[model samples]
Target: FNILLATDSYKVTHYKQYPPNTSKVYSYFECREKKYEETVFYGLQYILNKYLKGKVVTKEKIQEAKDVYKEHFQDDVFNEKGWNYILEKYDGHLPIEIKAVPEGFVIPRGNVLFTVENTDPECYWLTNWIETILVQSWYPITVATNSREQKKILAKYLLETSGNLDGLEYKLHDFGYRGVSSQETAGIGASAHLVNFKGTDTVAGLALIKKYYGTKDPVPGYSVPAAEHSTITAWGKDHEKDAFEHIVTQFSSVPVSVVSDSYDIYNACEKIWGEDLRHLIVSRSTQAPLIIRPDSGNPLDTVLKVLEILGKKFPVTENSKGYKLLPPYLRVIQGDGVDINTLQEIVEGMKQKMWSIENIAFGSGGGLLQKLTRDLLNCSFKCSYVVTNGLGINVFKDPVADPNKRSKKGRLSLHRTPAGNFVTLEEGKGDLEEYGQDLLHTVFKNGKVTKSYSFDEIRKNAQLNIEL
Candidate 1:
């Protein structure tokens, strides 16, 4: 039986910013100062001689890579001159040859999950230039993909624990942007969170949305106020009274939500707004007056307690008093750190008494998009090589491996047997034809995009691949 052998692929570029030519009024390539050039050269040399044992490519290829780098990074801009320079220097760039499984495959650990090949005979040295960025991109994606799966598990557990599995929604928001290495990475990282249908994300997430759905404005301000009517009254400190009265007087018949607990929420509900003012507020039927926020301690407990008071004070009866507060008109909203987890807890607590889950809404903020698990989102980049010439060669050690450091030395491949289990190819003997899947397609060939994929298409591909 034959299977396609695959390697990883990622976008790569060097010299992100170019010195603009004032005369030309546009950016153009120029040789990096000697120090930086030395850095690039030394970096490439280490990967070629030390990392690959000077075996991945021949001397002519390495020289060709140097030319490629010079062509791209010097005196050119339209053709990604700088990037091509680096690719040419290395001889063909590692990112181009290292084939990855489709983006969303749920790959397991200890597999040779990707394969890097020598795609261009004259520029094999270019492969080493891309090693750093390629591995860097894949690590985070792997972590993110794993995290999404974990989130699904947690959401399920929360639903079962709360016993409100039927209606509650689970949204996974990535809070790593602030801590991630760059804004670009953070933006896409959040998108990975959205892959599982996590709730709509914030700014960095907005980047993903824009990429897919086209740019638009984010919800202005964190808190959105919803009032049932204007011209409502509120009582508390002089400031509260002034603000409430001012708004009501300005907008007649306005629906408003008032925090009833300023002095005493229970008291306000029972006396101040209960009997005398109830009729007056509702009489404007065109627009019932609303009360602004009232502060009650321990919002959840206060809410339950207030409900009991209201039920006794204004029960549902065919022939009730002259007038009573409408159940729908009077509502409560809580706004302090209402993350999905807390909301889940609150709902579960309510369900304990078989209470109706209706009549409640939440306003969640920063907690959704500004906190995350890992501190720095750390990652490492290393080269893979086949051992040759005595005592296993120290393939590509540009940064040089130390005591706690090392690199995988071998031509790598992922293996799957008849029973449907996986293993890494460190040392093995099997039908080479079975591993033929082209994990790395020729995305770009001869300085042009060879293929393009839509966001939805990429997402669908990710969904189908268990090795993501």
Candidate 2:
């Protein structure tokens, strides 16, 4: 019990002692994955709001944190000086400032998304510790990048097949909540995906946007009433027709989706939906389309088959691109086996079949959120500049193990060139005035959020970046 009272004994000792000087330490975060030229900056606001905002760095809390640190690590590993510095220097609040690219902006790979530095150099180690926690988070940007890529794919298919971009926003839906690791991941990942699309089944995501991004009026995403196998089978397999009708009629005024694979998908599409309830579906209010979901089997083949079956039974039109478009009254949603690659396959398959890309939409679960890693974008955080004994030093790592892992040196600035491309310039590399203004802004200062954005504003910024 007395061990719990240990004060000024929490932190990585090496990190505390490694700083040659506490005068200044400038570190930047970037994505080094060469395959991706850009990344969507996100989750910084969430991290700040959840973990740092209004957090008073009191002596007791520091001591408590240190005790917990000691419990996990060897006693010699604890840094008394580091914890003491935080407890004494901060007074009652953290004095670190963070400059970052606005959340949802598309930051070019290798460019700094944010930078952290201690307002008081004595607390330099605090910045490094903060980075350790921050770097661990890559989901928002990862999910955002993946979502943007998916949107690009969908946009290309929509342009080629339909020649009009009417329904492109809702082409991909987020069905990843249950498949994600936790509610936070689900909410954050869904929000990232929503930056590129307007459809989602993860309600928690909408809550996150409203709570963190200051959304008030129109919500960031929308979902339709949909049924799963349980809902349809609960009505009995034999009464699949009733299950289908119940979804269509009960939610007749608005869009509704019904899983048709509760029994035989082919029979459900042809007999139950196409023959039995054809008139009711066709004659319903034209306000929303009735979406038939096929949850199993080969994704491409199933989609094509359903389209073919639906095309014959229901009305269809040929677009200017010479692709068949299903009537506004009926469409299909392929929610199973859908990732970026599978989504592309199904879309390309539709194009090859001369079917309009608008005839079907996609819903992704694990692939949208859980199926990503930090290496996917090569996210990295490292000190690029530091001050020691009144001399400024350019900090960098040139690892022989991997030349690609070599870090950028000196102070960094991310700016757009005259040609409208993003570029990161190190000190002495370029004239700051010749290049355009830096894109990164002072978003956080002294434990307070200096700048804020709403969900709608973030969406607009993301769309602009996507268009560019």
Candidate 3:
């Protein structure tokens, strides 16, 4: 977790390559993809708290990086002198400024999300050196975009079917804990999903929310006692009903999710849960809902097939939208093979058959947290302004072969028009009165946080009703 080691190796040698008399380098992070005109900006506060906060540089850390880089490069390319300068001048505080839009605000994709510039004249290379880790701000944006868009899609169908979004908060649960690359990733990505929902199985996400966001909410998310295939299958296939009975009766007073695909999901739902234990499920008045999870097969076909059986075994009501609704005591959750597109298709399938959206929920693993790339939004960080020999020059890349790689130039600032549209004021057109003053605030300066945000505030900023 040393910040010096948390960067691309090539960046270690970049300080020597800056233009002669270079005193400052200003860079910005942005998403260039056209698919999403707007994006949810998030995770920077967490990154700042977790990685860049406090006196991060020390004499020992500087010595460590020097030895590591010396061995890795098999030469003396490491800038030990620059590292020492920061330690001596700022007492190990990084000499850079970070300005960004408020965390969790949904802004136009093409605009600048955040900017970084060296505060000290000699630390010009530090701005881009931190890009390797700073650019990770895109991950939370990706997950939040996925979660938000999924919420919007599900809400549309919910209104058409159930006539209200009553159970929408718990519709999608995060099963992405084990699907992510590292524990830190699970914590970060899962917390991003929590901004939109109230259900999750990732415990690390809650820790991060408390540690980084300083959320006072003891529990930001909730999960019912649940079971996987192993616990059910371990009871032996012959006693599948016995396994179901075990968990339900043990946690009889609370909701319990039982996976029923151990042996013949059809038999498990139709005969075992629907008929055999019908009275047991209905009689439980303490915590009535019995969540059934189908861990395998076609999500639409299996869920609908199982829903059909449960619809008959227990009483079901009709919604104002003319769709059939299952009693609150029983519902289905398709736990695997779920993504935004697949879940949308399932919703459409259910609507066509007049089944209410409230009868089921979805769980996602790799689809939610793991299966995404920075290219999902085409995030990039590039230097746009550089000061050399006491002269500020607008700098950017514009490849003739691919205009898509073109970057913004000069000091950049984000602004909101009178009509609520966001735009990046660039090429020396920022900080003026014609448009709203810059939306980007100085979030961090010289390794100290200038602003702080809470989990509740972040959720409010990402309100689903924000006008496009």
Candidate 4:
């Protein structure tokens, strides 16, 4: 990828639009919201390692951008001189610094996660030029928070039902590899999801976790032998029982999941699995849980019926809290419309039936990975402070039309309050002695990643601790 072409097409010519004598630019990337109380700060190291590390700017690369931009605007609006000037110094490494909250730390949103500023006066444009790529952090951050928020929901109820969070890590599986927008999207988003859970069918993303997040293990995230719609339907509708029979015996000693929604989820549960292959599933070599996935129908009503059908077949056991649990060898997984909201709905319906949430699991495709927008967290990158002609100036944009769009002024610091709450000290007003230590630390400078977080450490940082 041409590093210069990584930004917005119109952003190429923004250099001429800045005020006269503008020598420096300071900006920050923030969620700018209080919706979730917290958001996961992640994916920066992936951005640095994959896209902006080392000598990124070169004459040939700059000329490639120039050729594209010249025809793009039907005029020579590309910043060739600025590119050449940036190329001349610091071994052609980008002269910028990024300080961020450490990766995988669950901190409150509406606070600065990372800050960007140009080290050289002439390269003020580079700050926001790189800002576009920095905003790519929004995806994994959002995805991690999305999955973490769901984990919060899962933990709250699991404690009430089971006394302990047994099998919690694998409760929510990532079936989103083929459902995401791009191969790269799956890699990053799945990696972020792994910070909270270990189960994923996006097996391809684990390579990225090893590559970018300092993990040497070949399998950082895991999946099991599972069958999708195609795998089951290929046996033909007349041979649905054969599909179930073949799969259980195919991997007799290991856990597996099968989608039962191809034709009749109810019949698949009631007749084939509940009667025809019931003996086969029960007599497994290891008695591993054969998870039947219903991929369609109303999440609440359908799952409740499926659970009752299986509860009769497999014999229901009651936990200490008096909720019904499925037999060890059989379970259900709802995958079709399973986002956080529908998952909540399904869990509620299960509780109404006095069924333990441990009786079933969830798989998410588009909902877990694709159903969010950057604005869901109100992610923004804005220039907040600048120095022009050797004079520092605090800056802001308090739009009367939308007061919420107002930007912060001057250099900013992220501090923790005495109560261990987050505090954003603005106008360059962080007091280290009284306001607690600044939480943001420099992660990158001069095209080099100064701080690298390991994958295991990241998981431990975001690990769930349910007080209930």
The most accurate candidate by TM-score is 3
lDDT of 2 by residue, 1-468 (tens): 121232233435546465565587788898984556778787888877876666456657657666767676755565566656655655545678888888878877778788888788767766776765578557788998889888888888888887767788898999998999888788889988988898999888888888889665668898888888888899886788888778788888888888888768899888888899998788866567889999999999999999989988898889888999888888899999998889989999999999988788899999888989999999988888888887878889988888889888887877877788888888635554778677778888877889878877787777743355
Colliding pairs, model 3: none
TM-score of predicted model 3? 0.97
Better of 1 and 3 by lDDT: 3
Q: Considering lDDT, where higher is better, how would the candidates rank from best to worst?
A: 3, 4, 2, 1
Model 1 gets an lDDT of 0.39
Candidate with the larger TM-score of 1 and 3: 3
Q: Which lDDT values do the candidates have, in the order given? A: 0.39, 0.80, 0.88, 0.86
What local lDDT score does residue 131 receive in model 1, on the 0 to 100 scale?
A: 48
Q: Report the lDDT tens digits of candidate 4 across residue range 67-183.
A: 988888999989898889878976679999988898988887779888999988889989989878999888999999999989888877777787888888888999899999999
Weakest lDDT window of 10 consecutive positions for candidate 1: 34-43
lDDT of 1 by residue, 344-372 (tens): 56555544533444334433334433333
lDDT of 4 at 330: 84
Model 4: per-residue Cα lDDT at residue 178: 90
User: What TM-scores do the predictions have?
Assistant: 0.46, 0.93, 0.97, 0.97
Q: Which candidate ranks first by lDDT, i.e. highest?
A: 3
